[PDB]
Every structure is written in C-alpha cells, then in structure tokens.
C-alpha cells in the first residue's frame, strides 16, 4: 500500500509540480506578450493614424 500509493503520489505530484512551473512561466510569458502587443499596436497606431 505505502509503496504503490507512494509511487503514484510522487508521480502525480511531480506532474503537478511541473505543471505549476510551466503555468507560471506561461503567466510571465503572457506578460511579455502583453507588452509586445502593447508597444507594437501602439507604434503601429501612429502609422495607421
């Protein structure tokens, strides 16, 4: 019981432990993407204006 449940628990815990990292990284990259779209559409806005 302790071996099998411990194994599956460690495995799924590793899964979530990774997923939170790519999640937060997705957040920071979402922020950089937000700035990118921001300044890009802003500078482009002068052109279309």
């Amino acid at each position: 019981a302790v071996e099998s449940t411990g194994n599956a628990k460690a495995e799924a815990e590793s899964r979530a432990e990774a997923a939170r990292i790519e999640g937060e990284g997705s957040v920071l990259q979402a922020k950089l993407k937000a700035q990118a779209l921001a300044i890009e559409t802003e500078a482009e806005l002068e052109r279309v204006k």
């Binding site: 302790v2 071996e3 411990g6 194994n7 460690a10």
Partner: protein
Amino acid sequence: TNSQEAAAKHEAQRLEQEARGRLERQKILDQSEAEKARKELLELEAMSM
C-alpha cells in the same frame, strides 16, 4: 519385524511432519520480518523515486 518397522516408520514420519511444520512456520516468520525491512526499503525507494 514388520510391526516394529511400521512403528518406527510412523514415528519418524510424524516427527518429520512436526519438524517440517516448525521450519515452515519459521519460514513464514522470516518472510514477515523480511517483509518489514522490504517495506522500509519501499519507503526510501518511494521518496527517492
């Protein structure tokens, strides 16, 4: 002579029976403590994995 031989045969057979039963119970016991140490090894293996 067949009678005394039958007596010694039944006796030695019963003794070997009781003996193998003892050694068998000792086997199950040793398997039990081996199961204990194996369980601890499963714990360390669980945390390590």
